[PDB]
Subunit: 492 residues, 4 copies
């Protein structure tokens, strides 16, 4: 999911629309934009679909104001109903709207809490709504008008104590300003930037990824430190504060492997370089373990793996060819909701340039293998076009565990690598060879960019969840609810 | 406007729909229904338009639960925007949704209060929204979870203490139940009824008029006493309490003159009888004041005046003839949003049976004349139809004052009787005679059915406003804010 | 169904909208408006729903031009799909659009013809589309540009030879003008009028009923003679001609009994007077056959029967009371598509003013009894409100045969009077007494207005179809297809 | 634009959808699919928007039949109105629906003709509609029911005799079958293919590009020869005939340069190879004309140029780096309707990986420069990204002439190369160098794949129009009628 916050001095609507467009790749299921207008009212527009379908001129005109927040959704909890599209809103205290990229591992627990203790009403099954509500009640502890930044920070500190999981949030509190914060583990991405308008008036903005800053002409300030909350007043005064007891930098690794745009710099790590470094480490592993292999061409599975593949072609000193033509009107299958929708998407998204495979042993390279969805079809395609032999290198290690921090992997059994050896997976997808990046490698691939990061968040790879609290019983519940069939039945 | 609220054991959506349909005459502008499903979640559906347009199968299937409220709107505050369609909802404390028929006379005073003081957010210009928030802020003064009936009532009384104006309201508090209250003056209509299901389960509903009970097969209980608050818990328990300091019954006289449906009984008064009664008084008045006149036929201006005219035709021993054909597909032109719309709607609404007027002295009868839209056009028609002489009789006294209790009449200058003597009004519409029911006759016509009512809310007639908080500055205020030009301008 | 044609000198769109509004009572299922603009292009807008829902300002603005035709649909053939909404259009020869009030009894036959012989393509199951196509092919016999009025007339004469049934049509032929014609039996209504704009420019218009002329300020010229076609050029030149070999005046009788608005004059017969005359004859029959009967009040079943009832009250010298309050947001149940929709409509459309029935023997009067739909519920209602005894007088004779001329009565078995004695019908609806108008009476009731009419079209009453060609095998097919269940299954 | 037509034994809707999806790059403005159901009725669904937006399950379930055609539009005539969305249909003779990819250069001449002469009605300003009507009017010259293959061909030849311009068309004649023809010059692409089902039933499809065959699992047959007409009957028979006087293959060169998808083979030419070939020629040109230059990296401007650039990077022995990230959710900015839309779309479409440009001399490569929209913005980005020197190379020759064959380039003044020497263009976009592929190189680059093609339709390049009916007055005409300001003005 992508969230954007802009506490500016001019109409932010097109700028947010534009921001969500570059972040569109983080959520294609719905999009929402909420602004505050001159009459301190919230102007909202959210619905299922792409940013380009969701907002029409008619909406844009209604979306007035100079401060606003937006969100593109990739459903990881609840349902695919437009009622779970973000932002969310609570009319008190003050009027708060919030966008969240993450996932609360203790949502059910906080739910009992909210009704019985806090007296708030959660109408959807979205954990982001819960989040906004935990925040809301915490904030509801400071009655004297007005809320002080210390109070806001104090509320988020309290929230940090209650909630568990991963979250990059952005919110607006009417008559107050824009608030943004990052979980105590720095799991989900969030960067702060600014655009100095004129000598004395500076606009600020937070976003999941820096590309949004770039595309809008905002300067990079830095990443919102883990556990740190930011607070920009309606008057333009920036406030900051560590709101976690033991803040630590454990960035999501999948963000580098696949999620983020290559042109973003997450925690001082150019996703682009990390991905190139991934190409280096993987091509090195291939050279070392597949040194006998006869390869005629190195073909990337668009779009994510390309540079990774490009680097691998260079390392192996083999040619890099765009054997697969991507349909520019089909999105990312992986972040699509249903497996059948994704499974089919793969055949409508890619088509071989037959000449590139005929009488050729090709090495197909992809950023990662998750459900197996892509690799399965891709290889057949490669074959049908005359590939003599097809090997597959994965820029990411086998993915054997559920993601509970903002990526839809609730069912381990849905992952192809689950309970399977590399060789079995190879046999399933029908590749002559299949090789996986080594975790320790991938880690250096990323770390090389910022050694300060000691440990990443890579549960989907090693099952060690940083927030600690994630256990087998939770994972069980989670699968019972979010497995593909349970989801389908919910889709009626 | 019309509100309904059903707390029962069966799904209420259809019942609420059918109720809104029979109360549709109270608000053709918008309709809303919100229910509580078994998950204790709100299911809402509200938008601009008639009940038949607003609700379709797709919507009905979504409106699950056995408890829900409904609303048909005739804007009297804010704007025509569907965002001000009702009901309104706030998620804390507990989750409350409310529908209001009336108008608060101290909105401005409360808007400022709600923010700086009670920390709530009002996103519209609707007083109904403000009203929900006072109840909420009052309700938010209790935390001993769960709310006891007493606290609800305590919030309502604290609410009445705060608000001024007319209001018949119904709401739902997630986890507690349905509540319904009436203003300390009993201006806006509200009745309670039940539907025993078995040995214990008895269904409860509230609605602006008893016709909604009739159609729904609900047993009539009584009018919700002025200032009373009704509270049906989720478990089915009915609690009532007087929440006004010194309540008094001052029913809106206009409900009888025109607003309500004749098959309704308001404050133990039958609108049908009250209307015939008006015709008796009007007939007797015509019999003495115009005695020396020659009338060939008595023609009602459909549809509200029909019975009145039938009865008048009775008094005078003259033929009642349905000289005017009303278009089944044109609603109440009176309650339409703009004067230009209403005017065009009158030629569409009615057409003359030339036979019934030619070479005859006709007596047109109408429940009332307000802006003079209908009468001005009706007379031109009678003439065109070959009518010798056209006389008009309004079952109602001259309307010279603005209504600030939930009836759209903000600008006294838009009322034809304003600044005019009967004869001036006669000349404008072009009648050869024009007679108005006297005020003391109207009141006696309605009281004849329930003498306990000592005084009626009849400010539109006598400029007397029971809430004693209405004044010239306030009236001028309304006039400016909502005059047809102000509204028409605002719509663009 | 209602059709309107206006060959005018100014924007006709609002005028047509207004025309369809007064004719709305002839078809509530869909509406369509097609104009010709300055660029001799057809501007069309048609869809299911009421005239008021179908056309929005956005449509109105697109509906430019000074010549146009409109239609309100009451489905009697095909399906209820918006694709069968009229007008219809064929791009050649010239560009022709047509609206039809009627029904072709030989549609299936003309269908084979059209493909094989005429080479035209019928895409819907509407006989009106077929009609337009038979016309189109006939017209396609005159190649030399341009078509002469003699040719147009000749085409319609040919059409009159081919097609069978009832039809009032209106069409526009691009670059040519507006054409209108009536079947050779004068079954369906159609009147011609005009509005002289300025010394030399006269606008013309045809319509199902004169009220449309009235409402628009058009002067009545006369009824389009049976078999006669009219042709108004784009230049304003009116042409006329008898286009049938044996033209005869056999007006639809149901039009007087129930279909048309009382304020219309069909074939020099004021529907209003015919209906009053119906009240006379029926009250006379009641006085003569129910002379012992003890009646306390005469109550009409709104809307159609009122004047009929009013007259009956006068004849019996009993009071006329509006015991039933009609919901002004529910239309005519009878012309509604499905029996369950109609059956229920009856309970949402009418509600007793209880006081009017309590301890009273009431005589309920309705224009007609068809399926029994209304009478059934009405009586229960009358009872539930305390009617001691309830009698029912029908302004129309028992209706025992299918209508194949423009009214949806394809299944005789759906008529309550089918194969039943008056007494059985009385027992079914549960009335203490039930009396039917005598055909011969009804005929004089109507004839009295225009003795020139020797014979009416009243097959639904006496099963003698004027077009002759209607036989049992056709009737059988017709029922197999249009019976309520076959229709329902078609509604999927 | 892209057209598809499938005559098969299975329902074609999904297949047509998937085909339109892979041909979506040929027209993002509108999409249309019309089928023939078992009742020999047309089922259409066309509207403005992408394939994914235009068609939803509701629509697909309605598009029944085994034969249907489809169309994805990029307006080049008329307006952007959905009424000019394709396919178009006429009901006589027999019922024909047609989809056209191209542009007729003698529209005006035919509009007058069709009315006064052939008595047909054109309701839009689309030449495709006019085209359908000529075929129709020609087809309407036969009456010996049914039409023999020969008559169809006879109508097509008579049609070609009448029309001028480029056109790849596909149509369906109710009761006969699918027909497809290509202009006498073979300008617009069209290929035929099949899908044998069993011993006899073989499915047939036509489509602007072979990729549509590939994705659909259809066997490639051949390109529809210039002037040829393909006719598949309803019973499955395939007839072909040359319907042009003196046909000749003059394929649209621009289809290879940019328009078509690389995995397509047009006129036995692979777009992928043609493009690499362009890169070889461009690479060799850069190698000689700029030899004394220092380039650090070669960066394609995604997405059309990618392979070209890869290959150029090959020629020069320089790194190919995906310096530019393209937004997956922004289509071909080139084919967007207005210059203001395209411009905003470029900043959205692309973003620079700062790493790849900083302190480097970059070589940007693009399939072409037309209005200069992309290049002007791309260069600013490279600079901003820290780039020392920014050089640009267009795989295509300077574009100085309007395309009148189905590519929106009406105003030569809107083409940057117009009235300019390379260097002037270099200065405008702000490159430190700008080189264009020579024309003779382009042609040789494409011909290298099918030397039989002697000449290409390349008027945009050399002002030479094979139809020899295009002239200055005609070009000036276009310019005036459709210049961005004319169009933008018209849209309002
Ligand atoms: O094994 P799977 O479950 O298919 O998951 C991994 C696939 C899917 C995803 O690609 P997309 O999200 O389809 O697209 P893109 O690479 O363009 O971001 C990812 O980059 C790998 O290719
Ligand atoms: O026996 P039935 O099949 O019910 O048919 C006859 C009824 C229905 C129809 O009334 P509506 O069409 O419902 O309404 P209105 O009288 O207002 O035109 C007609 O006037 C009789 O009342
Ligand atoms: C994409 C993402 O971060 C999910 C947000 C929240 N968990 C949800 O919408 O379920
Ligand atoms: C209402 C009417 O005349 C029907 C017209 C035609 N038969 C149809 O729509 O079926
Ligand atoms: C995209 C194309 O071929 C345009 C065809 C036709 N002229 C149109 O639809 O505008
Ligand atoms: Mn991928
Ligand atoms: Mn397999
Ligand atoms: Mn009235
Ligand atoms: Mn009736
Ligand atoms: Mn019964
Ligand atoms: Mn490009």
């Amino acid at each position: 999911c992508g969230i954007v916050g802009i506490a500016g001095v001019m109409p932010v609507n097109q700028s947010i629309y534009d921001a969500l467009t570059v972040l569109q790749h983080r959520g294609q299921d719905a999009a929402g934009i909420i602004t505050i207008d001159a009459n301190n009212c919230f102007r909202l527009r959210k619905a299922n679909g792409l940013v380009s379908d969701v907002f029409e001129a008619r909406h844009m005109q209604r979306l007035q104001g100079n401060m606003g927040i937006g969100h593109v959704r990739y459903p990881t909890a609840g349902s695919s109903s437009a009622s779970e599209a973000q932002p969310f809103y609570v009319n008190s205290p003050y009027g708060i709207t919030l966008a969240h990229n993450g996932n609360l591992t203790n949502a059910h627990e906080l739910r009992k809490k909210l009704f019985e203790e806090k007296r708030r009403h959660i109408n959807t099954t979205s954990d982001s709504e819960i989040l906004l509500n935990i925040f809301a009640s915490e904030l509801d502890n400071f009655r004297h008008y007005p809320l002080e930044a210390d109070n806001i920070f104090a509320a988020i500190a309290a929230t940090n104590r209650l909630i568990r999981g991963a979250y990059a949030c952005v919110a607006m509190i009417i008559g107050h300003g824009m608030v943004a914060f990052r979980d105590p583990n720095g799991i989900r991405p969030l960067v702060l930037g600014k655009r100095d308008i004129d000598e004395n008036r500076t606009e600020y903005m937070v976003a999941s990824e820096s590309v949004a800053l770039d595309t809008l002409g905002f300067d990079f300030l830095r990443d919102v430190a883990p556990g740190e909350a930011i607070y920009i007043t309606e008057e333009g005064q920036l406030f900051t504060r560590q709101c976690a007891d033991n803040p630590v930098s454990n960035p999501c690794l999948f963000e580098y492997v696949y999620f983020a745009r290559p042109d973003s710099f997450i925690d001082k790590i150019s996703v682009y370089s990390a991905r190139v470094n991934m190409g280096t480490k993987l091509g090195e592993k291939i050279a070392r373990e597949w040194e006998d292999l006869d390869i005629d061409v190195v073909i990337p599975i668009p779009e994510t793996s390309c540079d990774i593949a490009l680097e691998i072609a260079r390392i192996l000193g083999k040619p890099y060819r765009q054997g697969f033509v991507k349909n520019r009107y089909v999105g990312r299958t992986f972040i699509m909701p249903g497996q059948q929708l994704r499974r089919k998407s793969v055949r409508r998204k890619l088509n071989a340039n037959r000449a590139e495979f005929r009488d050729k042993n090709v090495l197909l390279v992809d950023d990662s293998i998750v459900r197996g969805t892509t690799s399965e079809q891709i290889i057949e395609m490669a074959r049908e076009a005359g590939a003599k032999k097809v090997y597959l290198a994965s820029a990411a290690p086998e993915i054997r565990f559920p993601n509970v921090y903002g990526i839809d992997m609730p069912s381990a059994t849905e992952l192809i690598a689950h309970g399977r050896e590399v060789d079995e997976i190879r046999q399933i997808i029908g590749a002559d060879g299949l090789i996986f990046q080594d975790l320790n490698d991938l880690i250096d691939a990323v770390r090389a960019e910022n050694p300060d990061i000691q440990q990443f968040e890579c549960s989907v790879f090693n099952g060690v969840y940083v927030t600690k609290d994630v256990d087998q019983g939770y994972l069980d519940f989670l699968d019972t609810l979010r497995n593909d069939d349970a989801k389908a039945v919910q889709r009626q």
